Amino acid sequence: VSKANVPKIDVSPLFGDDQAAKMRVAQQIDAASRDTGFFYAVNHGINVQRLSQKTKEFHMSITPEEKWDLAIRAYNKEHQDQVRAGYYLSIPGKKAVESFCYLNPNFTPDHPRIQAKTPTHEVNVWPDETKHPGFQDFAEQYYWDVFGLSSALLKGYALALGKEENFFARHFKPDDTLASVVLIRYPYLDPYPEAAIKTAADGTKLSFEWHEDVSLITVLYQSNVQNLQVETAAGYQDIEADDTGYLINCGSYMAHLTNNYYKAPIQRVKWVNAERQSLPFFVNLGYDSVIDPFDPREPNGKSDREPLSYGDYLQNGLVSLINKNGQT
Ligand SMILES: CC(C)[C@@H](NC(=O)[C@H](CS)NC(=O)CCC[C@H](N)C(=O)O)C(=O)O
Ligand SMILES: [Fe+3]
C-alpha cells in the first residue's frame, strides 16, 4: 500500500491582509484538491495540545448512567428530538467506537429554527457540570475556535476557484450554521471484538468503510495514530498522521457545486488496536443556504446543475451515510 501526497499548507496568510500571499495559499489548496483531495492546514493558531486528552478523559470518565441520559435517539427511544446531538454508545463485543456530537451553541429554545422544529436543528445536551467541570466551556469555545479557522479556509477555497474570498464564508454564519463537532474515542481492546472489524474488498481490516464526507469541507484533528486512507485510481493510499495539523478535505456539497472539479475524496478508516481520538468539524452552511453551481473547467464557467439548499442536502446525506455504513 502506497502513501498519499498530503501537503502541509501554512494557512496563516488566510487570516491576514496580504492578498498576494493569500493567493499563494489558494494555489496550494487548488493543487491539493485536484490531487488526492487532502491537505494538512498548519500554522493554524488553534491550541490542539489538550484536545485529545480532554476527549479521552471525557469518554473514560462518563458513566453508563450518564451515557443513557445523553444518548441520541438511536440508543434511547425516550430522546426523539436527539437525531444528531448527544452520546453515541459503544456496544462491547460488537461496536468499539463511541462519540459525543454537539451542534451550534446558538441553537436554543429561542432560536426560530428550534421554534419551527426544522429538521437537523437541535439544542445541545450536556453532562452535569460538577461531574465534568469545564467540559461544556471547553467544547463551546472549541466550536468557535474551529469556526474561525474554517472561515479562513473557506476564503482559501474561494480564491482557489477564481471567486471573491467570501464566496463560501458569507453563507457560514454563527447564527445559523449547521456545523457539528464530534468527539470520537477509538478504544484499545484486548481481545478486540472481530465483530467490530470489517474486511474491505482488498482485504484491509477496517473500523469504518468507504464514504464521502457530508459537508462543504471537513476540518479534522486526530491524535497521532495513523488510520485514514484515501482512494485513488491506483487504490487506497495511507494518509500519514500529523499531531498538530488539521486534515482538510472537500465534502460532497463542494463536489456538486464545482461540477466535480473539486471531488469529495472517498476515505476509509483502517482498524488499529490503539487508544486514539478523532475530532471532526463538519463545515455545514445554513438550512436555507444555496450556492449556485459553476464549472471552473468551462470558459464561460457555466454549469447546468441545480442549486441545492444545504439543509435538505444535509438531511439526505446524514441518513444515507447511516444506511450505508451503519449507525455510529
Ligand atoms: C475521520 C472520520 C473517518 C471519522 N468519522 C466520521 O467523521 C463519521 C463517519 S464518516 N462521520 C459521520 O458519521 C457523520 C457525523 C455527522 C454528525 N453526527 C452530525 O449530526 O453532524 C472517524 O475518525 O471515524
Ligand atoms: Fe469522512
Task: List, in order of start, the domains of the chain with CATH numbers.
Answer: 8-325 (2.60.120.330)
Going from the C-alpha of 59 to that of each of 49, 51, 252, 299, the distances in angstroms are 18, 13, 30, 52
Ligand 2 centroid–CA 267 distance in Å is 6
Q: Which residues have CB under 6 Å of ligand 1?
A: 84, 101, 180, 182, 184, 208, 211, 220, 269, 278, 280, 282, 318, 321, 328
Ligand nearest to the Cα of 321, by number? 1
Tell the residue number behind the cell numbers 501537503, with chain if given: 7
Residues with Cβ–ion distance below 5 A, ligand 2: 213, 267
Ligand 1 pocket test, pick from 51, 269, 272 with the greatest ligand atom count within 8 Å of Cβ, gives: 269
Cβ atoms of 126 and 214 within 8 Å: the answer is no
Cβ atoms of 85 and 122 within 8 Å: the answer is yes
Ligand 1 atom closest to the Cα of residue 208 is 24
State residue 146 phi and psi, 5-degree precision. -75, -25
> Which residue puts its alpha carbon closest to atom 23 of ligand 1?
278
Dist. CA 13–CA 10, nearest whole Å = 8
91 by Cβ neighbours in 10 Å (0-12 / 13-18 / 19+) ranks as: middle
State residue 222 phi and psi, 5-degree precision. -135, 150
- The pairing of strands 98-102 and 86-88 is antiparallel
Tell the residue number behind the cell numbers 474570498, with chain if given: 165
Ligand 1 centroid–CA 20 distance in Å is 35
- In terms of DSSP H, where are the helices of the chain? 19-34, 51-61, 64-70, 112-115, 135-160, 252-257, 310-325
Cβ atoms of 281 and 180 within 8 Å: the answer is yes
Dist. CA 228–CA 266, nearest whole Å = 11
Dist. CA 263–CA 252, nearest whole Å = 7
DSSP SS3 for 83: coil
Dist. CA 105–CA 84, nearest whole Å = 14
Which residues does residue 249 pair with via DSSP β-bridges, in sequence order? 38, 218
Dist. CA 287–CA 311, nearest whole Å = 4
> Which residue puts its alpha carbon closest to atom 21 of ligand 1?
180
Ligand 1 centroid–CA 175 distance in Å is 23
**DSSP 8-state symbol, 106:** T
Sequence-separated (6 or more) residues with CB below 8 Å from residue 238: 1, 2, 3, 4, 226, 228, 229, 270
Tell the residue number behind the cell numbers 479562513, with chain if given: 152
Name the nearest CA neighbour of 53 among 213, 185, 157. 185
> Which residue puts its alpha carbon closest to atom 14 of ligand 1?
318
Ligand 1 pocket test, pick from 229, 252, 282 with the greatest ligand atom count within 8 Å of Cβ, gives: 282
Q: In what order do the strands lie in the sheet with 235-238?
A: 198-199, 205-211, 267-270, 228-232, 235-238
Cβ atoms of 84 and 103 within 8 Å: the answer is yes
State residue 291 phi and psi, 5-degree precision. -110, 125
Ligand 1 atom closest to the Cα of residue 269 is 3
Name the nearest CA neighbour of 160 among 215, 217, 212. 217
Sequence-separated (6 or more) residues with CB below 8 Å from residue 270: 204, 205, 206, 207, 226, 227, 228, 229, 238
Sequence-separated (6 or more) residues with CB below 8 Å from residue 18: none
Which residues does residue 277 pair with via DSSP β-bridges, in sequence order? 185
